[PDB]
Design a protein around this ligand. Sequence first.
Ligand SMILES: O=C(O)CNC(=O)C(=O)O
Ligand SMILES: [Mg+2]
Ligand code: NI
Ligand SMILES: [Zn+2]
Length: 331
Amino acid sequence: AQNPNCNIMIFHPTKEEFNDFDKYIAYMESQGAHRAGLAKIIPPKEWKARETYDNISEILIATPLQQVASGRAGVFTQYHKKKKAMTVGEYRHLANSKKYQTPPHQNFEDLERKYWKNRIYNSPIYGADISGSLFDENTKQWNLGHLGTIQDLLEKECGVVIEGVNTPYLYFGMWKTTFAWHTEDMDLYSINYLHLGEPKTWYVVPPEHGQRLERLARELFPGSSRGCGAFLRHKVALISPTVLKENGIPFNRITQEAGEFMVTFPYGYHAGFNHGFNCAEAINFATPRWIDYGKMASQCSCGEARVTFSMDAFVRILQPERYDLWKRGQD
Ligand SMILES: O=C(O)CNC(=O)C(=O)O
Ligand SMILES: [Mg+2]
Ligand code: NI
Ligand SMILES: [Zn+2]
């Protein structure tokens, strides 16, 4: 069995290998990459996402989110307070201001230490889940807005024909902006490209050990666990690496830099934070190996998780027994 320790693998495809997306995912899986839950892909040196970023300040962040924390430094939840709209220009200036800027630090390890120590005492502002793309239409390889759709995957594998569309989202981050422990909707894959700016640190639990994380989360957030049998779907809970190590939860960590892709694999729990002002683009996708994870994915039916239009058909086709209850949660 390849990669039995479930280490995060890093890949360096050639320009030739970068032509066929699906083929390269299948290659990474042949090497055991999926066992980690996350992989890094460094594009060939000849590739570019777009020519320049010179005009990105005119993008609108319609609903910036202030991420307010409650708990202790290593075990906390965050709620999103909606703020008034601002342009990317305005947001970048805010990120770089004395109140919000990255503190002086020696290296990534020191910054990680400062994050876990001090995150809860600040409320950074995140621009999330903004429909759009920053890939040039002429970028033909690994363009996140030109992937084959999840609907077409399910049609090809299973023969059914469903509504729904699948488009990318932009994320604008600053120091301490935080993504909580989660898997993807319907335990899909995700792919994330860091377009510009400062790094993003990721933590991941191997898919084969995801239920270990869920058990700890039930222990650490006991009121939340009574409210919902899949409350990590709410995307609000943080658990530090120190706490994970104390409770024997297997995980790995890696820092993504501008110009690099990360892939999350089905049922790979992940969490992380941004080092300073940055812009990422991400999208969900499917392969034939996903279908069995889609069929088994947990669902939030308490009403909190509320998700896209396109998830309806996935639940309806793959999880018909659950459909009625899940849709009462949506409606
Ligand atoms: O970049 C972020 O804030 C969050 N991204 C993801 O969880 C992802 O790409 O799967
Ligand atoms: Mg612009
Ligand atoms: Ni994700
Ligand atoms: Zn719920």
